[PDB]
Amino acid sequence: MALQLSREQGITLRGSAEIVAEFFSFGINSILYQRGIYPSETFTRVQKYGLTLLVTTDLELIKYLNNVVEQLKDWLYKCSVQKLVVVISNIESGEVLERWQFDIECDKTAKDDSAPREKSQKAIQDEIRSVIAQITATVTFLPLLEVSCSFDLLIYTDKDLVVPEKWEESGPQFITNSEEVRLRSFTTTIHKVNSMVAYKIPVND
């Protein structure tokens, strides 16, 4: 909430949204490299958040995230933004192969809570560094790409109450035979982001 203030280039919410926005875009793009959603030859090396990260120079994907990021601000920032779930499934087989679930928590402003240290962006570097690395790291642990999977992007927001409904929770089944492992999570007085990923497990011991 705010008055006499345009949302074209604000510093209050838009600021925190900028980080979370770039954090998501970068995190998503980085995953394109790690997951291999498409030709890696469309990569671009860049230095952000204090560390070096790779990116996908896809006009279609950039356009996919562009509209999503634009709306994420109006659509998601209007509510508060909460959870995100990216489900990558093999398009040639029509079955889920890799599901990436990350949490996005942002506030409207600092009612009475200062940010630790001179800048809270530090925690960001660690999270954005662990996120981009946790994806690529596991990838090394994972085999090679082969299927051109499809992308399923989920958006989650918070609600007052309206009776508990629960989403993507109520139900033992989820994919078919995968493993869920926690990567890392960062919490800031202005915003908190979580990182979790799961992959199909071909009957392993």
What CATH number does residue 203 fall under?
3.30.900.10
Which residues sit opposite 171 in a β-bridge?
A: none
| 8 A C-beta contact, residue 8 and residue 34 | no
Look-up: residue for tokens 């629960």? 166
Q: Do the beta carbons of residue 167 and residue 156 sit within 8 Å?
A: yes
Side-chain half-sphere CA neighbours of 75 within 13 A: 10
For the chain, the domain total comes to: 1
Q: Which of 135, 127, 106, 130 is nearest to 20 (CA)?
A: 106
> What is the C-alpha to C-alpha distance for residues 79 and 75, in angstroms, rounded to an integer?
7
For the chain, the maximum distance between any two Cα atoms, rounded to a whole number of angstroms, is: 61
* Cβ-based neighbour number of residue 76 at 10 Å: 23
First to last CA, the chain: 52
23 by Cβ neighbours in 10 Å (0-12 / 13-18 / 19+) ranks as buried
Cα–Cα dist 80/73, whole Å: 9
Burial of residue 171, with CB atoms counted within 10 A of its CB: 0-12 exposed, 13-18 middle, 19 or more buried: exposed
The contacts of residue 120 (CB under 8 Å, 6+ apart) are 188, 189, 190
Report the relative pairing of strands 191-200 and 95-106 from DSSP bridges: antiparallel
Residue 86 in contact with residue 101, Cβ under 8 Å?
A: yes
Strands (E), 67-166: 83-90, 95-106, 149-156
This structure was determined by NMR
Structure tokens at 161: 């109450």
Q: Which residue range is the domain that position 181 belongs to?
A: 1-205
Query: What amino acid occupies position 15?
Result: G
Name which of 184, 182, 152, 156 is nearest 169 in CA terms.
Answer: 156
